[PDB]
Design a protein around this ligand. Sequence first.
Ligand code: SF4
Ligand code: NA
Ligand code: NA
Lengths: 113, 107, 88
Amino acid sequence: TEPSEKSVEIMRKFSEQYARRSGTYFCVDKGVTSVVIKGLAEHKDSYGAPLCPCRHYDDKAAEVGQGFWNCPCVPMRERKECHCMLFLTPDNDFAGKDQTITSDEIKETTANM
Amino acid sequence: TTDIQVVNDSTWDSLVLKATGPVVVDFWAPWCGPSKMIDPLVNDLAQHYTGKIKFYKLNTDESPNTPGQYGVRSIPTIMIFVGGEKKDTIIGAVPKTTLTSSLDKFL
Amino acid sequence: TEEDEKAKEKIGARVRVTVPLKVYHVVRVPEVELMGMEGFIKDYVVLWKGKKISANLPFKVQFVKEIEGRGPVKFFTHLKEDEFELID
Ligand code: SF4
Ligand code: NA
Ligand code: NA
């Protein structure tokens, strides 16, 4: 149920790198950021790809194979739309000013979850 | 505090479809950030509408068949039921005023 | 499968984008406005190797756009049914 720290650290480093590269910022609620990253890590553990954690699927193996919802999802790559509020454009009312999130931030924010 | 009642695939028929009066169901998932950020809002509205609207929470990971039946895709999703029929659908984190207004239409 | 069979028929048909929409994945073109551009549907990506996918932008549409100094760049973008019109 809980993702390994190897997958969390991979997805944490990807999200920092994808945020600068897309010109997007993490949400002012950094709990959203940490939770979503952990959800990507858990899906990567169970299916080998970071399937989106804010979608419900009928066939997760098929979704991973087609790739539409493998993070970064098609909507984020093409339209910069991220509905898990992981990558937010600066004009978003919930966009913060950080493009970094330390592994310590994820550990204290997701504590007792 | 009394936390919002859980609903599952096994209990969907008896708790939601056969209920009297409006029923609100919050479709959530344990690792969906936006679903956790509206949790205090849904707890707030459950208190505001006590005795007038019944609230349930459904973990789409532990009860996958109900969201599959109703086309729940993006999480969070809030759906309102009356007499066993879907009457409204609110997708994503929304502000309190949007939720109050949609819920008010069911008295 | 009566909306999937209706959608499958549109594969290969020519379309035009009817709503303002900007995309950021065209290679070495940082931003492209797609309002008014014409292309054709190359796939209905909801269907994949006999299985069904929950894609919210199900129509993979091929576009070619003329770039000054470089020549026509070919790219794909996924669209919804209400974001384009069919041509003739
Ligand atoms: S919505 Fe797309 S980009 Fe955002 S976290 Fe989910 S898969 Fe990644
Ligand atoms: Na974020
Ligand atoms: Na039941």
